């Protein structure tokens, strides 16, 4: 199909108490349930979550329908974009298995398994893959001896990563441990800042024994490393230029879709080529951009919001 259906959503965290003492202003105005005003500039979105909004409700509005569609055979992608101390990890992971405080990913894992456990004539297979785009290279986060993987396309023109590690999982914890293993292998540097973009893949295969009909859906979880304004003046500079280039290539595709372009330049980067069949078209997408309301951050929460704006129609 040719919908476009990409939604961008912004979640502001509470300034916390320790940031309120160091001396700061809240610098974030809201009007509508979907617009935010910083420095008297309005930024419109599909949805804006303020500090009082629970984890469950960000999951219900960003992810819950994407998961449903994957359990129905479709593809989907979720992006998490944020600068450091924006509330990204809290939003994506949170305190997992506090049922009130877990973020997006753990609720996704439990909604998949509650769906499975809820079914006799239905056979399942969940494959998880986990890799990163670091310095334009695809590294496997589940098998670190595999540092430079390639993208190819099969007979049906759907893209794949030759050699990426696929793990079969059968329980919510077996999924969370695969994720923790990968995280220890991601490129981080300097506070704790992602030097790469990570892609987590949940592939949910189903077979119905009586109708002998099959289903197969791909859910991608992409953690975007924040953009850097960078002038080691060497290996780190390389890291920053690639982060920015691949984000701009991503923006280009996303914006082509949102603006109803009839040529969406997927081929331009490895990440958008990998996610080609899960970005746009009959696939559903949510970009969650996380921002700090804090004044200390106003220069770059402005930059985050501008990035989110690239996805507005």
Residue numbers in the entry: 4 to 122, 124 to 194, 199 to 239, 243 to 324
From the paper:
Kinesins are a family of microtubule-based motors that play important roles in intracellular transport and cell division. Kinesin-1 transports cargo within cells, a process tightly coupled with ATP hydrolysis. Whereas kinesin-1 in solution is mostly loaded with ADP, ADP release is accelerated several thousand-fold upon microtubule binding. Here we characterized kinesin-1 P-loop mutations that interfere with ADP binding and determined the structure of the corresponding mutated nucleotide-free kinesins.
We also found that when T92 is mutated to a valine, the nucleotide content of this mutant was very low compared with that of wild-type kinesin. Together with the observation that the T92V fluorescence does not increase upon incubation with mant-ADP, these data indicate that T92V has lost most of the kinesin affinity for ADP. Using these T87A crystals as seeds, we were also able to crystallize wild-type apo-kinesin-1 and the T92V mutant and to determine their structures. Whereas most of the following analysis was performed taking the apo-T87A structure as a reference, identical conclusions could be reached from these wild-type apo-kinesin and T92V isomorphous structures. Taken together, these observations suggest that the P-loop destabilization in nucleotide-free T87A, as well as in the isomorphous structure of wild-type apo-kinesin and of T92V, is the combined result of ADP release and of the loss of the T87-E236 interactions.
